[PDB]
């Protein structure tokens, strides 16, 4: 295939979580949630994440309950069987911007903005792809590219023509921790956040792996000693043959 049809492959950036012993930077995760909430959530859902998932990752229990309680969710019908709404609870999932696919496509000139809960696992490149894509809109498409109407040129997207316009510009977010909200900073944070969303076990998984590696390594070393020990009678065996 042409390189265009594949998309340019994203650079390997040194994410804090790259590295066998490295967790996510939770401060970056928190910043990234704020980017999701103020920019991406206009078009993209995060349906597999519940408010409770943020607790003790990015937010305290209280902050997350506050986020839940601001929204209205469908309750069980009342006693006359009429529909009712209730305020959100931590068990509720973060609600999407559109009620269905058709509404989503209508608002985006036919393109359907994917749910972002898994997008870091669902594209080759992961965090790097999300970072490259958000930051990789050139001012002008390379001369000779014909964009379909409502498409934007982005070399990292396969085919080049992406239905999502550039959305991160310096200072679209005001971070609550005083970090300068540059395009690059926001893309890094949101890409980290989405990576966490796709694999929330990441931190625990790598710690258990460290324990496993250590125990299994020691057992492997000992199994070699024990094998050699038990086999030495066979390896050391000597013969004397006297033809009869």
């Amino acid at each position: 295939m042409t390189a265009a049809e594949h998309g340019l492959h994203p650079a390997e950036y040194p994410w804090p979580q790259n590295g066998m012993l490295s967790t996510f930077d939770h401060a970056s995760l928190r910043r990234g949630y704020q980017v999701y909430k103020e920019v991406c959530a206009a078009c993209h859902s995060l349906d597999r994440i519940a408010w409770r998932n943020l607790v003790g990752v990015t937010h305290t229990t209280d902050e997350a309950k506050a986020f839940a309680e601001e929204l209205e969710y469908d309750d069980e019908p009342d006693d006359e069987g009429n529909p009712r709404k209730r305020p959100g609870k931590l068990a509720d999932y973060i609600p999407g911007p559109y009620p269905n696919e058709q509404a989503a496509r209508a608002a985006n000139q036919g393109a359907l903005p994917p749910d972002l809960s898994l997008i870091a696992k669902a594209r080759h490149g992961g965090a790097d792809y999300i970072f490259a894509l958000l930051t990789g809109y050139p001012d002008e498409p390379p001369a000779g590219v014909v964009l379909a109407p409502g498409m934007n040129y982005n070399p990292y997207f396969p085919g080049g023509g992406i239905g999502m316009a550039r959305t991160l510009f310096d200072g679209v977010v005001e971070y609550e921790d005083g970090t300068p909200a540059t395009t690059s900073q926001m893309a890094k944070d949101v890409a980290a956040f989405l990576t966490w969303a796709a694999e929330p076990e990441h931190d625990e998984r790598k710690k258990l792996g460290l324990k496993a590696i250590i125990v299994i390594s020691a057992m492997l070393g000992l199994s070699v000693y024990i094998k050699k020990f038990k086999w030495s009678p066979i390896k050391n065996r000597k013969f004397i043959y006297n033809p009869p």
Partner: protein
């Protein structure tokens, strides 16, 4: 050192008891040791490190 063999190793009942008690101790101490090690190499990154702001 004959003494050590005689007490902990000679009877298999004693040897298996020793191995399981050692596994208990190892399991508890290894858990604690890795926890501390993990927190040092990932310093300022984890929720416990930023939680104090809230």
């Amino acid at each position: 050192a004959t003494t050590f063999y005689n007490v902990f190793v000679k009877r298999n009942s004693a040897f298996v008891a020793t191995i399981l008690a050692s596994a208990f101790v190892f399991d508890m101490t290894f858990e604690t040791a890795i926890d501390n090690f993990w927190d040092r190499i990932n310093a300022g990154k984890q929720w416990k490190d930023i939680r104090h702001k809230y």
